[PDB]
Amino acid sequence: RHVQWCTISHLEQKKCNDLVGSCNVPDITLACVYRSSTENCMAAIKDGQADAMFLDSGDVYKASLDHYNLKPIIAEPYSLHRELTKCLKHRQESLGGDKMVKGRYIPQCDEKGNYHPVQCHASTGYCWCVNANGEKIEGTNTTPVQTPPTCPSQVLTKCLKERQEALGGKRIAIGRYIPQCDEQGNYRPMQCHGSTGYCWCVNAIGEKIEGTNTPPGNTQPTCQSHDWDTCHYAVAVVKNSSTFQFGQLKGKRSCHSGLSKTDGWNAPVNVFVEKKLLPWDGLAKGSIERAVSKFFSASCIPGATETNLCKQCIGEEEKKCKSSHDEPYYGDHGAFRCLQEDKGDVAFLKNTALPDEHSGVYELLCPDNTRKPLNKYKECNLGKVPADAVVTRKAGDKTKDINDFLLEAQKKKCKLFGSPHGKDLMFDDSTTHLAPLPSEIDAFFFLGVKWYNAMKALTEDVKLPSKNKVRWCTINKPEMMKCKDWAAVSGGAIACTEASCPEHCVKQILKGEADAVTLDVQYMYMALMCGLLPAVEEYPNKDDFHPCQIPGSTIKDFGTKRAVALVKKSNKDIKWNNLKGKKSCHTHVGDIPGWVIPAGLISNQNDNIDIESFFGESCAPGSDTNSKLCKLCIGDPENPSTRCSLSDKEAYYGNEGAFRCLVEKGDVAFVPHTVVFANTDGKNPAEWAKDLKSEDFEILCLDGSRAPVTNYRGCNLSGLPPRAIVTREESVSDVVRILINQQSLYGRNGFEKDMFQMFSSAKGQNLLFNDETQCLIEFDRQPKDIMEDYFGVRYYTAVYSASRSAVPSELIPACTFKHCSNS
Ligand SMILES: NC1=N[C@H]2[C@H](COC(=O)NS(=O)(=O)O)N=C(N)N3CCC(O)(O)[C@]23N1
C-alpha cells in the first residue's frame, strides 16, 4: 500500500522526503510528488499523479468544483462553545422520554459527568462495559445472577494523558514542559514552563493563545477561563509604529497569505465590501481581484495576476507570486514576514500565525477602526474561518490508506507538524491532531452553508430563487411529470427538481436547490437531525373534513394509524410484560406498526435483545425461512416455496394476514388499530374471518392491563405521526402560504379542481402526496424539541429511545457537522 503526497514547493518536498525516511508506518509507504503550486497539485490528484494534500478552506471550496472534483477527508477537530457531557445529555434525554414506556435504561454518570465504565439496566439487572461515548462494548453483558463485569478505566483527558506521557513513566520530566490540569482534567488557563520560567495562556483543550507568551520577570496577560471557542480567526496585523485605521486602508501596501486563502482573501475582501471601502458589489463592476487592484497601491497576494498585487512578493524568477513556499511571502507566515520586512503596511492571515510573545511591535487592526493587542483577536478580527483539510479524489479510492497512514503516524509521534526547513510545510505548524471527517462529508457540509455561499458569492452573481415559488423535489419520473403538470397550472408558484430518492431531496433542500418534499415517517429523523422542519403534514382522516374546509380549526383526531398489540379475549393470561417467548404475528419486517414500533419497545425494555430471540414461534414475513420468525408462516395454499415471503403469496402477510395468523395459530398480532374492525363483525367474507366478532379481541396496554379494541387511542404501542412536507427553517412561512393557496385551488374542494388535482394522478399512485390525503395542514409548532413535537413523545421514545444520537442514515454525521461561521 502506498500514499503519494502532493507537495507544492521545494521546501515542502524536502520535509515530505524527510518523513519518508523518519516515519515508519508498517504496511503503508509514503511517497512525495512535487508540483509547482497548489493548483498543479489539485490537478495531479484529480489525474491520479498523487493522492492527497492539505488545503486551506478556500482551496477546499475551489477543489470541490467540477474542474478538480476533490473532497475533504481529514481535519483537526474544533469546538464552538462548552457543551454538556455526553453522559449527562443522555441522562436528560432518557429521563425526558415517555414515562409510560417503563423499564428503560438511564445511564449512570460520575462526578465529572462521564459514563461509569460499568453501565447497568435497572429493570433487567444486566450490566456491561462502555467506551467513553457510552456505547456498549459488545460481548461484555453480564446477567443479574453474576457480579458486574470488570471494565477498563476511562481514557484520560487530553491534559492528564499529555501529563502522563510528558512524565514518560519516570516521576519528574526534568527540564521539559509538563502541562498543569484542573480538577475536571482540563487545562488550567495559565501554563508555565517549569525550567525556563515562561508562562502563557491556553484554552480549555490546551491550545496556546497567541500574544500571551511571557518571559520570567514580566507580568502576564490575563488568561480567560472556560475558553471552548477554538475556531480560527482571520485577522489584520500591523506594526505599532504606523497609525492608520482599518477604514483608511485605501492606497496602502498589503501582504496576503494568498489569493485563494480564506484568511488572506475571502475574509478581508468580504469586510471591504460590507464597509463599502471597495467600489464593488457584483460581477458587473469587474472582477473582485481588479477592484482590489485599484484599492491597494502595491501588495503581495500569491496566485494573483494583476501586476501591482504581485509587486511586493520576492520569489525568484518564475517562483514570484506563486501559491508555493518557493515564494517567501506565501502563506500566513509569509504574509507576516512581508510585514516584518516592511514590504507591506498590513498583513492578512489568521490568529494561529500571530507571534506567541506578548511584548513586541505588532498589534491588530480592527474593522471598527480601532487597534488592539495580539491576544484580543476574538474581539478584533475579520471573522471566524473554516477549518482546513486533507483532500483526495471524490471517488475516495485512497481515503482508507490516507487515513490509516496519518492515524498510525500520529500514534508513533512522527514529525508531521514542524520542520527545520520552514513553517507550515505539508500541514499547518499549529495543527496538533488530524481526525477523519464524516464519510459523507463534502465541501458544503465541511465549510457550512454560510461560508460556502460567501465564497461562491465572490465568483458569480448568485441569483436567489423567489420566495413566491416552491421548487418541489421529485424522486421518480412519474412524480416529475405530475409536478410539471402542476407547474403548468400554478402560474409560477410551483417548479420541479429531480432526485433519485428522498434523502437526495433532503440534500437538495439543505443546499438551496429545492424547497420542499413530502417525507415518509422513516426519513423524518434524518430530516429533522439535518435541521429541516415540517411545514405542513398530510391529514388522512376520511371522517372529518372540517379541518380541511376551515383552516386553523381544531382537529379532534388526526386519523393516523395506531400500532396495537392484538390478542383474543379467551387468552386471558397474556399481558404486555409477559410476551417473552409467546407466539407473535407481524404484518412484515420493516412495517412501522407491525415491526419497527414493537421491535423498538422490546429493545428498549430488554437490553436490545433480538426481536428474533424474544418470541417463541412467530410469523414475520421477510425474515430468514429457517428462523423461528417464519415457523408460523403458511407459505401458499397452492404449494409451488413462497413461505415467509414478502408477498400476498404468504397467507399471513400484511394487515389482514397478521390477523389471520392470530386467529389460526397465534397468540399476539402487531397491527394497525384498523385491522380488527376491517375483518370482524362480518366485513371479510372469507371462511376464516366468517362473522368473527370485534368483541372477541382486546389490545394490550403498556402498563400490563388490557382494553377493548375500540380504545386504541389510549391503549396502543404508539400512534404514528403523519407524513410531513419539510423545508428549511427560513422557508416554512413561504411554503405554508404557497401550498395552502394551491390547495384552495386544486385540493379536494379546490375552486379550480377541474384544472388539476393535487392528490391524484393518471400517471401513477401516490405521486408527490399520498392519494388518500384529505388536505395538508400547517404544522402547529410547539415550544418543545422538534423530535418530540413531530414524532410525539411515545413514538420518539419507542423507536429512538427519545434520543438525538441515533444514526439511521450516514448523512446525519455530515449534515450535523459544526461550522466556524459569523453573524
Ligand atoms: N405540533 C403537533 N401537532 C400534532 C400533529 C398531529 O396531531 C395529532 O396526531 N393529533 S391527534 O390525532 O389528536 O393525536 N402533528 C404531529 N406530527 N404531531 C405529533 C404529536 C402531536 O400529535 O402532538 C403533533 N404535534
| Residue closest by Cα to atom 21 of ligand 1 | 792
Q: Exposed, middle or buried, 642 (CB in 10 Å: 0-12/13-18/19+)?
A: middle
Strand 668-672 versus strand 718-719 pairing type: unpaired
Q: Please tell me the distance between residue 792's alpha carbon and the centre of ligand 1 in angstroms.
A: 7
Closest CA to 341 of 325, 356, 328: 328
Q: Is 722 in the pocket of ligand 1 (CB under 6 A)?
A: yes
Helix (H, G, I), strand (E, B) or coil at 565: strand
d(CA 297, CA 315): 19
Alpha-carbon gap, residue 203 to 520, rounded angstroms? 44
Measured CA distances, 33 to 10, 30, 113, 398, 679 (Å): 11, 10, 47, 16, 73
Residue 34, SS3?
A: strand
* Ligand 1 center from residue 558 Cα (angstroms): 7
What is each CA distance from 640 to 588, 631, 634, 635, in whole angstroms? 21, 18, 12, 9
3 state DSSP class of 680: coil
Q: Is 346 within 8 Å of 257 (Cβ atoms)? A: no
CB contact at 8 A, 345 and 252: yes
List the grid coordinates of 806.
Answer: 441515533
The angle subtended at Cα 781 by Cα 490 and Cα 540, nearest 5°, is 60
Helix or strand run (H / E) with residue 614: helix 611-614
Q: Identify which of 39, 31, 51, 29 has the alpha carbon closest to the alpha carbon of residue 8.
A: 39
Probe residue for ligand 1, chosen from 726, 790, 791 as the CB with the greatest number of ligand atoms within 8 Å: 790
* CA–centroid distance for 268 within its chain: 29
Q: Looking at ligand 1, which residue's alpha carbon is closest to its atom 10?
A: 558
Indicate the helix (H) or strand (E) that contains 693: none
* Atom 13 of ligand 1, nearest CA residue: 557
Alpha-carbon distance values, 210 to 162, 332, 345, 416 (Å): 21, 14, 21, 21
Q: Which helix (H) or strand (E) holds 5?
A: strand 2-7
- The H helix count followed by the E strand count for the chain is 23, 30
C-alpha 193/C-alpha 191 separation (Å) is 7
- Ligand 1 centroid–CA 364 distance in Å is 54
- The candidate with the shortest Cα–Cα distance to 511, out of 476, 462, 478, 475, is 462
**Dist. CA 621–CA 606, nearest whole Å:** 23
What gap in Å lies between CA 463 and CA 38, rounded to an integer? 30
Cβ-contact 167, 160 below 8 angstroms: no
Which atom of ligand 1 is nearest to 781's Cα? Answer: 1
How many other C-beta atoms lie within 10 A of the C-beta of residue 66?
Answer: 5
Q: Give the integer Cα–Cα distance in Å for 273 and 705.
A: 69
Which helix or strand (DSSP H or E) is residue 81 part of?
none
Q: How many residues does the chain have?
A: 823
**For 446, how many CA atoms within 13 A lie in the half-sphere containing its CB?**
30
Amino acid found at 185: G
Please tell me the distance between residue 711's alpha carbon and the centre of ligand 1 in angstroms. 18
Residue 31 near residue 4 (C-beta atoms within 8 A): yes
Q: Is the CB–ligand 1 distance for residue 785 below 6 Å?
A: no
Q: Please tell me the CATH code under which domain 470-553+721-815 is placed.
A: 3.40.190.10
Residue environment code for 712-727, b if the CB has 16+ CB neighbours within 10 A, otherwise e: beebbbbbbbbbbbbb
CB-based contacts of 735, cutoff 8 Å, min separation 6: 470, 515, 516, 535, 536, 725, 727
Give the span between the Cα atoms of 137 and 153, in whole angstroms: 13
Please state, in angstroms and as integers, the Cα–Cα distance from residue 431 to each residue in 77, 207, 208, 282, 417, following that order: 10, 10, 11, 36, 6
476 conformational bin, left if phi > 0, alpha if psi -120 to 50, beta if neither: beta
Residue 782 alpha carbon, nearest atom of ligand 1 = 1
Nearest Cα to Cα of residue 470 among 449, 445, 492: 492
- Residue 125 carries which DSSP code? T
Say which CATH class 562-719 falls into: alpha beta
User: Residue 524's Cα: distance from chain center in Å?
Assistant: 14
| 3-state secondary structure at position 507 | helix
Q: Is 705 in the pocket of ligand 1 (CB under 6 A)?
A: no
Q: Ligand 1: which residue has its CA nearest to atom 18?
A: 790
Contact yes or no for 71/442 (Cβ under 8 A): yes
- Which atom of ligand 1 is nearest the CA belonging to 559? 12
CA distance linking residue 175 with residue 164, whole number of Å: 15
Q: 63: buried, middle or exposed (CB in 10 Å: 19+, 13-18, 0-12)?
A: buried
Q: How far is CA 365 from CA 212, 237, 249, 270, in A?
A: 18, 6, 10, 16
SS3 498: strand
Please report how many Cα atoms fall inside a 13 Å half-sphere around the Cα of residue 64, on the Cβ side: 22
Ligand 1 within 6 A of CB of 537: yes
Query: How far is 158 from 186, CA to CA, in rounded Å?
Result: 7
In terms of Cβ atoms closer than 10 Å to its own Cβ (0-12, 13-18, 19+), residue 404 is: middle
Centre of ligand 1 to C-alpha 720, Å, is 9
C-beta of 182 in contact with ligand 1 (< 6 A): no
- As to burial, measured by CB atoms within 10 angstroms (0-12 exposed, 13-18 middle, 19+ buried), residue 729 is exposed
Q: How would you classify the pairing of strands 584-586 and 668-672?
A: parallel
Count the neighbouring beta carbons within 10 Å of the beta carbon of residue 754. Answer: 8
Distance CA 515, CA 300 (A): 43
Q: Are strands 533-539 and 775-778 parallel, antiparallel or unpaired?
A: antiparallel
Q: Which residues of 658-689 are buried (b: 16+ CB within 10 A; e: fewer)?
A: bbbbbbebbbbbbbbbebbebbbeeebeeeeb
For ligand 1, atom 3: residue with the closest CA:
780
Contacts of 674 (CB under 8 A, 6+ apart): 561, 655
Nearest CA to ligand 1 atom 20: 792
Say what the resolution is, in angstroms. 1.9
Query: What is the DSSP code (8-state) at residue 155?
Result: P
Instruction: Give the integer Cα–Cα distance in Å for 9 and 30.
Output: 17
Residue 495 main-chain phi, psi, to 5 deg: -135, 175
Find all residues with CB under 8 Å of 670, minimum gap 6, and list them.
563, 564, 565, 566, 584, 585, 586, 587, 593, 594, 595, 597, 598, 658, 717
Cβ atoms within 10 Å, residue 571: 14
Distance 214 CA to ligand 1 centre (A): 61
Distance CA 64, CA 67 (A): 8
With beta carbons less than 8 A apart as the criterion, state whether 293 and 415 touch: no
What 3 state SS string does 409-477 have?
A: HHHCCCCCCCCCCCCCCCCCCCCCCCEECCCCCCHHHHHCHHHHHHHHHCCCCCCCCCCCCEEEEECCH
Determine whether the shortest distance from the Cβ of 778 to ligand 1 is under 6 A.
no
Which grid cell sits at 424?
Answer: 507550515
Ligand 1 contacts CB of residue 558 (under 6 A): yes
Cβ-contact 211, 221 below 8 angstroms = yes
Contact 760, 771 (CB under 8 A): yes
Judged by phi (left if over 0) then psi (alpha if -120 to 50, else beta), residue 813 lies in alpha
Does residue 540 have its Cβ closer than 6 Å to ligand 1?
Answer: no
Cα separation, 796 vs 803, whole angstroms:
8
Pairing mode, strands 53-55 and 389-393: antiparallel
N-term to C-term CA, the chain: 45
Method: X-ray
Question: How many C-beta atoms lie closer than 10 Å to residue 576's C-beta?
Answer: 18
User: Ligand 1: distance of its center to the CA of 682 in Å?
Assistant: 33
- Its sign, for the CA torsion 313, 314, 316, 317, is positive
Phi, psi for 814 (deg, rounded to 5): -80, -40
Q: Which of 457, 574, 460, 464 is nearest to 513 (CA)?
A: 464
Ligand 1: residue of 537, 556, 789 to mutate (most ligand atoms within 8 A of CB) is 789
Phi-psi region of 226 (alpha: psi -120 to 50; beta: other; left: phi over 0): left
CB burial of 150-167 (b: ≥16 within 10 Å; e: otherwise) equals ebeeeeebbbeebbeeee
Cβ of 557 less than 6 Å from ligand 1: yes
On whether the CB atoms of residues 450 and 819 are closer than 8 A, the answer is yes
State if residue 622 touches ligand 1 by the CB under 6 angstroms criterion: no
CA-nearest residue for atom 17, ligand 1, is 790
Q: What is the largest CA-CA distance in the chain?
A: 99
Query: What sign does the CA torsion over 672, 678, 680, 686 have?
Result: negative
Nearest residue CA, atom 15 of ligand 1?
790
What's the helix, strand, coil split of the chain in %, to 5?
30, 15, 55
In short, whether 83's Cβ falls inside 6 Å of ligand 1 is no
User: For residue 689, what are the contacts with CB-CB under 8 A and spacing of at least 6?
Assistant: 659, 663, 679, 680, 683
Q: Any idea what DSSP says for residue 357?
A: B
Distance from residue 721's CA to the centre of ligand 1 (Å)? 7
Q: Which fold has domain 2-78+387-457?
A: D-Maltodextrin-Binding Protein; domain 2 (3.40.190)
Tell whether ligand 1 has an atom less than 6 A from the beta carbon of residue 789: yes
**Contact (Cβ atoms closer than 8 angstroms) between residue 457 and residue 265:** no
Is the CB of 555 inside a 6 Å radius of any atom of ligand 1? yes
Q: Residue 325 contacts by C-beta under 8 Å, 6 or more apart in sequence?
A: 8, 9, 10, 11, 12, 331, 334, 422, 424, 425
Atom of ligand 1 nearest to the CA of 557: 12
- b/e map of 325-335 (b: 16 or more CB within 10 Å)? bbbbbbbbbbb
**CA dist., res. 374 & res. 239, Å (int):** 11
Q: What is the side-by-side order of every strand in the sheet holding 517-519?
A: 517-519, 724-727, 533-539, 775-778
CA of 97 to the centre of ligand 1 (A): 17
Selecting from 3.40.50.1780, 3.40.50.620, 3.40.50.720, 3.40.190.10, what CATH number does the domain 232-385 have? 3.40.190.10
Distance from Cα 661 to the centre of ligand 1, integer Å: 32
Hey, do 470-553+721-815 and 562-719 end up sharing a CATH topology, with the first three levels equal? yes
- Enumerate the β-bridge partners of residue 71: 392
Atom of ligand 1 nearest to the CA of 789: 25
Distance CA 183, CA 778 (A): 50
Q: How is residue 633 written as a grid cell? A: 408462516
Delimit the domains of the chain by residue range: 2-78+387-457, 232-385, 470-553+721-815, 562-719
Å from CA of 725 to ligand 1 middle? 14
3-state secondary structure of 780: coil
Here the cell at position 510 is 439543505
Phi and psi based region of residue 552 (left: phi greater than 0; alpha: psi -120 to 50; beta: remaining): left
